[PDB]
């Protein structure tokens, strides 16, 4: 309900409830793992080799056929089992060739239960009795200072939890303008949030047909692994519309020049470097992650006066998201051919 003749100063930067939300999401993330299964018997010598393919001597395939010893239901029986892995999760140990998983020198590892999904659902946050939640209903609000158009609420609106290191997906979008928000724009190391008005579609897929394979580790245990790959050995990717991306960049360049002088040249670059999951944007699609190269987008310039954009991805199985100290996470291989469509909402 609305409230009138009212001036209230807000701040997103000294705001709380992002802190305990960042606590709570990782907390529920760990609550979603204690029923699941460890992979402590799996860290073992791996006889790996190249996948069956017409191999290019100069480029590299990203799938390895790894055979190894594994336990059975019974202790005295050992078995020989193979699977496939990406290049980005095994390393070479030392003639012959023998690999191992990268986490197995330094951390434990947990398979996710294939029951649980990773799609978002809207979380409505609410306050207990004795507190209230306010909301700035102003159109233009850079993120700090007074807001005359406010209204209280009992519960927050729909918030879907995404995970995207750049290019925040499926988020809520602005009313009419394209807005840019920061804490102190003249400070450079503080980021700049870009909430642009119109959503812009993305397609993302892995075109490879994927068979899983169950492996019994021990008594009542289970393990899933990439078995055979039927069809053309292809490469995962994403696409966006060309002219929409051009027009939205025109809108954000129109909005930037208020802050940086009206006669100013603005261009873009790919990100400088660092971890693999900050050089890209890193998302989840159908319960499987993507680290997908973004250099085909931020390569333009701007002057003070049917096609698409395709961009290639990479697929890792084991992660350490939020960069924990000994905690890792395996991701199960999923069937079929996966694609998903998301509305790109903002930029960082």
């Amino acid at each position: 309900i609305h409230l009138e003749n009212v001036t209230e100063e807000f701040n997103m930067w000294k705001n709380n409830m992002v802190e305990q939300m960042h606590t709570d999401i990782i907390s529920l993330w760990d609550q979603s793992l204690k029923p699941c299964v460890k992979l402590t018997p799996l860290c073992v010598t791996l006889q790996c080799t190249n996948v069956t393919n017409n191999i290019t001597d100069d480029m590299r395939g990203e799938l390895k056929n790894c055979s190894f010893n594994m336990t059975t239901e019974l202790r005295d029986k050992k078995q020989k089992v193979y699977s496939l892995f990406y290049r980005l999760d095994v390393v070479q140990i030392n003639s012959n060739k023998e690999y191992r998983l990268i986490n197995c020198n330094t951390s434990a590892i947990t398979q996710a239960c294939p029951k649980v999904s990773f799609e978002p659902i809207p979380i409505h946050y609410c306050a207990p009795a004795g507190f209230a939640i306010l909301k700035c209903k102003d159109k233009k609000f850079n993120g700090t200072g007074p807001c005359p158009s406010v209204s209280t609420v009992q519960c927050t609106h729909g918030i879907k939890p995404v995970v995207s290191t750049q290019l925040l997906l499926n988020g809520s979008l602005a009313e009419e303008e394209v807005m840019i928000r920061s804490e102190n724009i003249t400070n450079n190391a503080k980021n700049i949030l870009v909430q642009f008005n119109t959503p812009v579609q993305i397609n993302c897929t892995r075109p490879n047909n994927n068979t899983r394979k169950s492996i019994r580790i021990g008594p009542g245990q289970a393990f899933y692994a990439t078995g055979d790959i039927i069809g053309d050995i292809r490469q995962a990717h994403c696409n966006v519309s060309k002219a929409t991306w051009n027009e939205t960049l025109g809108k954000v360049v129109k909005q930037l020049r208020k802050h940086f002088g009206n006669n100013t040249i603005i261009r873009f670059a790919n990100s400088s470097g660092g971890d693999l999951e900050v050089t890209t944007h890193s998302f989840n699609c159908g319960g499987e992650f993507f680290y997908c190269n973004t250099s085909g987008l931020f390569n333009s310039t701007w002057i003070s006066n049917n096609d698409s954009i395709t961009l290639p991805c990479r697929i890792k199985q084991i992660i350490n998201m939020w960069q924990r100290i000994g905690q890792a996470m395996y991701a199960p291989p999923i069937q079929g051919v996966i694609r998903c469509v998301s509305n790109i909402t903002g930029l960082i």
Partner: antibody, heavy 132, light 105 residues
């Protein structure tokens, strides 16, 4: 209308550097790819490889060294040179053009495609036999 | 490798390795005493001169074997057949497949 005319000795001693030539009919040697095919009696053929100017000169990686394909744009012929004729080398050999084509299955910019080949026309042959 | 049918009937001639990826099958035939002769140069394409009813398996099917369907056969169809498969996954087949002879009654 083309037809090709193979030419060689037919009776070759072992460990002898064999050569064959191939005459043309109408279409000059510049315009199209060129290829050689061998076949033993009662067997499937083995495509020896293809030759064309400007780097289009790949060989069968079976032998890959003791065979040398070439063209004659001055005389408009197709030349093969061989090294070290062995007992299994007794086979009928064929000079023939070929036509390519891009079999494409995905994103072209990701090299997700390849080039097949097919010999549209054929030669007439020369029954090379190795003996002593 | 010998297949006999009545002339004017249908016939299926199979050759080569089972499909792994997308393929480009090529079909030659061989009359006795001649050179080879192309009939089918793509998965289901033919050039001029050769008539129809020389069907081929489509190249998108995964885990099947290259086939050649000849309906309404004739004595002039009496020639050896040759598959030439071009998988996107397997390497270059510098040799052809197996020569199956089609003989007629």
């Amino acid at each position: 209308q083309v037809h090709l005319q193979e030419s060689g000795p037919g009776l070759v001693k072992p460990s002898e550097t064999l050569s064959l030539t191939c005459n043309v009919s109408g279409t000059l040697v510049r315009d199209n790819y060129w290829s050689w095919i061998r076949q033993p009696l009662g067997k499937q053929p083995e495509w020896i490889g293809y030759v064309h100017d400007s780097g289009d000169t790949n060989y069968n990686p079976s032998l890959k060294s003791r065979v040398h394909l070439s063209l004659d744009k001055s005389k408009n012929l197709v030349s093969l040179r061989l090294t070290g004729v062995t007992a299994a080398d007794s086979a009928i050999y064929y000079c023939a053009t070929t036509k390519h084509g891009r079999r494409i299955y995905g994103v072209v910019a990701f090299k997700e495609w390849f080039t097949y080949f097919y010999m549209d026309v054929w030669g007439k042959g020369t029954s090379v036999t190795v003996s002593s | 490798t010998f297949v006999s049918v009545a002339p004017g009937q249908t016939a299926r001639i199979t050759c080569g390795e089972e499909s792994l990826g997308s393929r480009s099958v090529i079909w030659y035939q061989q009359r006795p005493g001649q050179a080879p002769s192309l009939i089918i140069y793509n998965n289901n394409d033919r050039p001029s001169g050769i008539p129809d009813r020389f069907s081929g398996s489509p190249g998108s099917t995964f885990g099947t074997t290259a086939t050649l369907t000849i309906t309404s056969v004739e004595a002039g169809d009496e020639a050896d057949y040759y598959c030439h498969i071009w998988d996107s996954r397997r390497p270059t087949n510098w040799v052809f497949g197996e020569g199956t002879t089609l003989i007629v009654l």
